[PDB]
Amino acid sequence: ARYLGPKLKLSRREGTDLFLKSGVRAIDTKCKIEQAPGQHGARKPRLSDYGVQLREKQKVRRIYGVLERQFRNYYKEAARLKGNTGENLLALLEGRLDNVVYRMGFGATRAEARQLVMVNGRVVNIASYQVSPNDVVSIREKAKKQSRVKAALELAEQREKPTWLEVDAGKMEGTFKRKPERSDLSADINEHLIVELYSK
Amino acid sequence: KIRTLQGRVVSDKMEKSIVVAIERFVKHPIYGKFIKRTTKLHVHDENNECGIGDVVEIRECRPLSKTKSWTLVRVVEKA
Amino acid sequence: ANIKSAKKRAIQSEKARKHNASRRSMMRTFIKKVYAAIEAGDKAAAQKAFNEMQPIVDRQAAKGLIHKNKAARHKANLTAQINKLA
Amino acid sequence: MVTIRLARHGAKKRPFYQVVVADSRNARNGRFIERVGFFNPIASEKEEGTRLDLDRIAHWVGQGATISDRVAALIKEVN
RNA sequence: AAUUGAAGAGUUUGAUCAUGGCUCAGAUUGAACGCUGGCGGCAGGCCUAACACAUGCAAGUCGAACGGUAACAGGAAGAAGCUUGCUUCUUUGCUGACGAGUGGCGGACGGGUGAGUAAUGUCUGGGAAACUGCCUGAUGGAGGGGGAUAACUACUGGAAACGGUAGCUAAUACCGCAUAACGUCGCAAGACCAAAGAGGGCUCUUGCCAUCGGAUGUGCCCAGAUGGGAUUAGCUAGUAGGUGGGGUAACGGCUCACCUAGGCGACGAUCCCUAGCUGGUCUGAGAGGAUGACCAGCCACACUGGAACUGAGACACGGUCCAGACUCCUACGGGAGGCAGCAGUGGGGAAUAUUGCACAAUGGGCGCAAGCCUGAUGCAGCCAUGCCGCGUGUAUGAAGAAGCCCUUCGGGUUGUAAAGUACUUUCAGCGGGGAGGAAGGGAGUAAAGUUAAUACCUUUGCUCAUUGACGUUACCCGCAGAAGAAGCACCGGCUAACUCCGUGCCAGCAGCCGCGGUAAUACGGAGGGUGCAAGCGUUAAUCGGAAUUACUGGGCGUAAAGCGCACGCAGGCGGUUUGUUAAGUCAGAUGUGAAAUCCCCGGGCUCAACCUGGGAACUGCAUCUGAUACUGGCAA
Ligand SMILES: [K+]
Ligand SMILES: [K+]
Ligand SMILES: [K+]
Ligand SMILES: [K+]
Ligand SMILES: [K+]
Ligand SMILES: [K+]
Ligand SMILES: [K+]
Ligand SMILES: [K+]
Ligand SMILES: [K+]
Ligand SMILES: [K+]
Ligand SMILES: [K+]
Ligand SMILES: [K+]
Ligand SMILES: [Mg+2]
Ligand SMILES: [Mg+2]
Ligand SMILES: [Mg+2]
Ligand SMILES: [Mg+2]
Ligand SMILES: [Mg+2]
Ligand SMILES: [Mg+2]
Ligand SMILES: [Mg+2]
Ligand SMILES: [Mg+2]
Ligand SMILES: [Mg+2]
Ligand SMILES: [Mg+2]
Ligand SMILES: [Mg+2]
Ligand SMILES: [Mg+2]
Ligand SMILES: [Mg+2]
Ligand SMILES: [Mg+2]
Ligand SMILES: [Mg+2]
Ligand SMILES: [Mg+2]
Ligand SMILES: [Mg+2]
Ligand SMILES: [Mg+2]
Ligand SMILES: [Mg+2]
Ligand SMILES: [Mg+2]
Ligand SMILES: [Mg+2]
Ligand SMILES: [Mg+2]
Ligand SMILES: [Mg+2]
Ligand SMILES: [Mg+2]
Ligand SMILES: [Mg+2]
Ligand SMILES: [Mg+2]
Ligand SMILES: [Mg+2]
Ligand SMILES: [Mg+2]
Ligand SMILES: [Mg+2]
Numbered sequence A: 001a002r003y004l005g006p007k008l009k010l011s012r013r014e015g016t017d018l019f020l021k022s023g024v025r026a027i028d029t030k031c032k033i034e035q036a037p038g039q040h041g042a043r044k045p046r047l048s049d050y051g052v053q054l055r056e057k058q059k060v061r062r063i064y065g066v067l068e069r070q071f072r073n074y075y076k077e078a079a080r081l082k083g084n085t086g087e088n089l090l091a092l093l094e095g096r097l098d099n100v101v102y103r104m105g106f107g108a109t110r111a112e113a114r115q116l117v118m119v120n121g122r123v124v125n126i127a128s129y130q131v132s133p134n135d136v137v138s139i140r141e142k143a144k145k146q147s148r149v150k151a152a153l154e155l156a157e158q159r160e161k162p163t164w165l166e167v168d169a170g171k172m173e174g175t176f177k178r179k180p181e182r183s184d185l186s187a188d189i190n191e192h193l194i195v196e197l198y199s200k
Numbered sequence B: 001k002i003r004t005l006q007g008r009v010v011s012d013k014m015e016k017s018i019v020v021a022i023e024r025f026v027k028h029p030i031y032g033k034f035i036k037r038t039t040k041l042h043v044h045d046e047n048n049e050c051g052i053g054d055v056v057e058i059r060e061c062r063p064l065s066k067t068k069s070w071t072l073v074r075v076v077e078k079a
Numbered sequence C: 001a002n003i004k005s006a007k008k009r010a011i012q013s014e015k016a017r018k019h020n021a022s023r024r025s026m027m028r029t030f031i032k033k034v035y036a037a038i039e040a041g042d043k044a045a046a047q048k049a050f051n052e053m054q055p056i057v058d059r060q061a062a063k064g065l066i067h068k069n070k071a072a073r074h075k076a077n078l079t080a081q082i083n084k085l086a
Numbered sequence D: 001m002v003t004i005r006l007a008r009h010g011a012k013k014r015p016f017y018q019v020v021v022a023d024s025r026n027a028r029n030g031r032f033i034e035r036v037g038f039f040n041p042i043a044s045e046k047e048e049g050t051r052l053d054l055d056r057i058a059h060w061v062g063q064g065a066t067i068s069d070r071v072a073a074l075i076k077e078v079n
Numbered sequence E: 001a002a003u004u005g006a007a008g009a010g011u012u013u014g015a016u017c018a019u020g021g022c023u024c025a026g027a028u029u030g031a032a033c034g035c036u037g038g039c040g041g042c043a044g045g046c047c048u049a050a051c052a053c054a055u056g057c058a059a060g061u062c063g064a065a066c067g068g069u070a071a072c073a074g075g076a077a078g079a080a081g082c083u084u085g086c087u088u089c090u091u092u093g094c095u096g097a098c099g100a101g102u103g104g105c106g107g108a109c110g111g112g113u114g115a116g117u118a119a120u121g122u123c124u125g126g127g128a129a130a131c132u133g134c135c136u137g138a139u140g141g142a143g144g145g146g147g148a149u150a151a152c153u154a155c156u157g158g159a160a161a162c163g164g165u166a167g168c169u170a171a172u173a174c175c176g177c178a179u180a181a182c183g184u185c186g187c188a189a190g191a192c193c194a195a196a197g198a199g200g201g202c203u204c205u206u207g208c209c210a211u212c213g214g215a216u217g218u219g220c221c222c223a224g225a226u227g228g229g230a231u232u233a234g235c236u237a238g239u240a241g242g243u244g245g246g247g248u249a250a251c252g253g254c255u256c257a258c259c260u261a262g263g264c265g266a267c268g269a270u271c272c273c274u275a276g277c278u279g280g281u282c283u284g285a286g287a288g289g290a291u292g293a294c295c296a297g298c299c300a301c302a303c304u305g306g307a308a309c310u311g312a313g314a315c316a317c318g319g320u321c322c323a324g325a326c327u328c329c330u331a332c333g334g335g336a337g338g339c340a341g342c343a344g345u346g347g348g349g350a351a352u353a354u355u356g357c358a359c360a361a362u363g364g365g366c367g368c369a370a371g372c373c374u375g376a377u378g379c380a381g382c383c384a385u386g387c388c389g390c391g392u393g394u395a396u397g398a399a400g401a402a403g404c405c406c407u408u409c410g411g412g413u414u415g416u417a418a419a420g421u422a423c424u425u426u427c428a429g430c431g432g433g434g435a436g437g438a439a440g441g442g443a444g445u446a447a448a449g450u451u452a453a454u455a456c457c458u459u460u461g462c463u464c465a466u467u468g469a470c471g472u473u474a475c476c477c478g479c480a481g482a483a484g485a486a487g488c489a490c491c492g493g494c495u496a497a498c499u500c501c502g503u504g505c506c507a508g509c510a511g512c513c514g515c516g517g518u519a520a521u522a523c524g525g526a527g528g529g530u531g532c533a534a535g536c537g538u539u540a541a542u543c544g545g546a547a548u549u550a551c552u553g554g555g556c557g558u559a560a561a562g563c564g565c566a567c568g569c570a571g572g573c574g575g576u577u578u579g580u581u582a583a584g585u586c587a588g589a590u591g592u593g594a595a596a597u598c599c600c601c602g603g604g605c606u607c608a609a610c611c612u613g614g615g616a617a618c619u620g621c622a623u624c625u626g627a628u629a630c631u632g633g634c635a636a
């Protein structure tokens, strides 16, 4: 139920930074981001229309560590909800709480943030929890002596912190103010390929 | 009103009884064409008024025999 | 029977069968006398037999041996037939 | 006779009762005449634990419906 | 807000376009099998033999109907080792209670199964000639007698099951009599029909009878709809109708006698084959197609065939009688039994669980109640069967260590992977705390209403104890240490993923095309990789793709397909004008279309699955009122 394997290979297979590393040093110095993994790695054949649609879906999955069954259920939810399905799907993935622990800067990676796993002042230890507009997300007091969370925040303080949220120091809390639009997120995900892949 | 059907007498051979054909015009469930369908009722006719070809109003009543649960109301048209 | 209450019901129902059969037989005997008087074709004999029958069918209806509608039918059928006789 | 009683719905360890008017002989969760309310015994604070259509209950009690012990107790604590 | 919804590909050929089948990608399941397997939540779990069934349990209850007193617990009398105060052996229903018995109510519910049933069924919508325990409203009654009988007692027959004889006794058991009308019969006059007490302290409570209502349940009738076969075309004598008698709760050929000769059928009768029906379920863009397991409604069945009895209700799963096929006990004379209740056994099968705990909750039976009963139900056990959630670490870490594997021997790749070093402790283990599912019921006291009464009773408050099968509960806190926890399929194209070695048309692979005869990305192993993940594959099965049965939505010159040609009955279709009708059609309204499910907006379990509030939907059916262009009818 978790991918517990070498993490750089995913970014290598996708051929893009998926933000899967802590950032103690550069991605180029860590691995060959240009090259796909394995013995036949410097090779790069033509990929089919199917193969392209697959790799876009596997991109959006492998960032978050969402396995296929759970990802499929998000697609179904996104298609069900009113309006644009591809946008609804990204909104649902962005609405997840386990993004937030990482994104607010408590884990160095999402894998670390997931090891570390309060919303509206109530404890929630579920990665898949959909955080709503106007909800305050925050940390406990009992585990603020961990060096992990200290280091992770210093890693977080070099990134561009998200632009629909409000992370705070000390008591360490922030409001999910609104759901992100597609404008907020990377114009790089071609989510129509995922919509098309599941329509197949 | 009280409930009635209208139909054509197709037999008057029984004593105090007639057979009335009710024609209905119904849309075919699959193919959509309107089709003629027929329901034959055994009807009570105390006086033996009706003849083969008459148009008759009939009403539902209590069972009067094995096959009869309808009675004659009027003759609309004699043949 | 396996169950205790079922054994008791079998006994009670047999007792009730005997009791009922006696009263049913008696009631039918009194009804038959009215029909027999009619068959012969004598009104005074039939009205006598009917006046004996009438309390019996009514009482057996009250006791639940027959329904009151059945008692009513017997009185109606025979009153009609007695009226047609002379 | 006709009774007003609780049909047990919900899930395992988490009962939710529908308040139904039924012929007493029918199974608890089976054939009923009319639903007239619900009762959640494990309802969180803020949520409505009990709703009863007391007018419909009064109609049925007027026609000789009995009430289970629990529904009688729920009728008390509501009003 | 609540139908935002529709993808193709491989394979005929030297190549092409078309035609056309085969095959694949998807979704799904009561699944099974193989490999593998950590935890939890919620659900599901004999689809085959309606095969046969050992054992336990699944229906009792009421002493406030009754005689009683086998228990054992008091109480009173009368006496013995006499702990000068009583145990004990005795007597006694006097009292709490209560075995057996009479009586009442229940046993027709609840639970199981799908054999039969293609229409005495089911679904939708109507109807008239009916009954209906318990519950409920109203109006009255509730008087006075009698003969029994079980238990019991004496005798007694049987191996047992189970009786026989005689005597005795009670009632809310049973039976007259009286009373008798908004009841029954009758045109009327008349005639006729009932009943039961018990309990608490005259009064209250409860029961009894009658009649008319209500409610609920059930019986009955009609129309439409609900599989296949014409290589089944005729079927029918109580048959179709009538009259009269009988019968039923009730209409009715329901039955019988007589009379008429009908009735059904190409709009498929009759016969044959298959089948429980529905809400729904799966699939599908939809229209369809497939399906009816779980949950809920209806039906049917209870070892097989038949039958009734009792009863408000049964032709009765754990009742009766008979017969039959089985099987078991026997003193050989006779007797006994029916898991398609729950659990379980054998058998069949690819395959489907424990001879568990509890009535604490909800519901059911009986009871004034306390309570008793309840394999319904609530729970627990077993199983990755499904769905949903979580874990199996996290960070760093070049030495790019070994060992792999490949290499044009430069290197590349596995791989930051491992180690090493910081850390973390969910879940599992171990130890401490702790909801909720409990409402009620029981005690005396509080006031008011009944009342001769400041009584009993009723109700509501009042206070004090007390009720949990699950359960070592959810959940919380603490301890120890990465510790206890990753597999399965695939990598020639379709199809995401490629190399080396072994083999040499062999061994083998294969869904389809194909692959293998010495440099095989196709076989087998390895290294690497891709996809899924506590699962993964395979097989089976349904829909999809398949516009490949084409209603939506196809064809027939040569691909499969125009009868050899005509006439013509049924049937389908019908030029043009006016009037009329209002069947089709259209509009509106009303009733109905169970709940669940689906969908929408919310709510609750930390989330999810799951549970749940309201809505929408249920495309239908019926009725009423309108419209009159078009189609139909009628008239000209
Ligand atoms: K009894
Ligand atoms: K083809
Ligand atoms: K039953
Ligand atoms: K069946
Ligand atoms: K007949
Ligand atoms: K007749
Ligand atoms: K269907
Ligand atoms: K049978
Ligand atoms: K009864
Ligand atoms: K109980
Ligand atoms: K067509
Ligand atoms: K017209
Ligand atoms: Mg999972
Ligand atoms: Mg070729
Ligand atoms: Mg007793
Ligand atoms: Mg039942
Ligand atoms: Mg008396
Ligand atoms: Mg009596
Ligand atoms: Mg009298
Ligand atoms: Mg054929
Ligand atoms: Mg043949
Ligand atoms: Mg007759
Ligand atoms: Mg009939
Ligand atoms: Mg069958
Ligand atoms: Mg289609
Ligand atoms: Mg079924
Ligand atoms: Mg069907
Ligand atoms: Mg009877
Ligand atoms: Mg029974
Ligand atoms: Mg049985
Ligand atoms: Mg069983
Ligand atoms: Mg076997
Ligand atoms: Mg028992
Ligand atoms: Mg490929
Ligand atoms: Mg080779
Ligand atoms: Mg298949
Ligand atoms: Mg099709
Ligand atoms: Mg074609
Ligand atoms: Mg040819
Ligand atoms: Mg040809
Ligand atoms: Mg020709």
Ligand SMILES: [Mg+2]
Pocket (backbone or CB within 6 Å): none
């Ligand atoms: Mg011609």
Ligand SMILES: [Mg+2]
Pocket (backbone or CB within 6 Å): none
């Ligand atoms: Mg015309």
Ligand SMILES: [Mg+2]
Pocket (backbone or CB within 6 Å): E582
């Ligand atoms: Mg019309």
Ligand SMILES: [Mg+2]
Pocket (backbone or CB within 6 Å): none
């Ligand atoms: Mg509904």
Ligand SMILES: [Mg+2]
Pocket (backbone or CB within 6 Å): none
């Ligand atoms: Mg016209």
